[PDB]
Amino acid sequence: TRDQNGTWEMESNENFEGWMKALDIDFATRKIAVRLTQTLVIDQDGDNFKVKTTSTFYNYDVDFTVGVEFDEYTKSLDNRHVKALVTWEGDVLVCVQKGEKENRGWKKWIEGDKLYLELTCGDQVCRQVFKKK
Ligand SMILES: *C/C=C(C)/C=C/C=C(C)/C=C/C1=C(C)CCCC1(C)C
């Protein structure tokens, strides 16, 4: 389904360290971040998304409209400028972040009662699975 609305709690996180390292997230931050639990809150109305990711210490918050390119500064993450675009490929939501890093972005989709998130950067892929809270 294309409906990704809800509050989603992480149950699995594969190669998170590899992905953070590919983004050059500093080693000391990685140590704190790597095994934190995550809650992902998605508000979706038509093309309009509001996405909030939360953990004990960190948050990543972003609003976008499907099909509308937006320039991003990746602030507390890796401090880079990218050109972001989120679109649908079937029922997979696909984000491409054009910039220095190759293959940078994510894909998000629903299967059953679960949300799947694939984060990509360089040659690294991180796969996360969430259950609806
Ligand atoms: C569509 C879902 C998206 C775009 C989720 C993005 C989530 C992040 C970029 C996660 C960031 C982090 C945390 C939530 C805490 C652990 C360390 C970070 C900064 C990598």
Curated annotation (Swiss-Prot):
Q: In which tissues is it expressed?
A: Higher expression in adult small intestine and to a much lesser extent in fetal kidney.
- The answer, when asked if Repeat is one of the entry's keywords, is no
According to its UniProt entry, one GO biological process term is: fatty acid transport
Judging by the UniProt lineage, the source's domain of life is Eukaryota
Alphabetized GO MF terms: fatty acid binding; molecular carrier activity; retinal binding; retinoid binding; retinol binding
Q: Does Cytoplasm appear among the keywords?
A: yes
- Where located? Cytoplasm
UniProt xrefs under InterPro entries: Calycin, Fatty_acid-bd, ILBP, Lipocln_cytosolic_FA-bd_dom
One Pfam family assigned to this protein is Lipocalin
Q: What is known of its domains?
A: Forms a beta-barrel structure that accommodates hydrophobic ligands in its interior.
Give the protein's recorded name: Retinol-binding protein 2
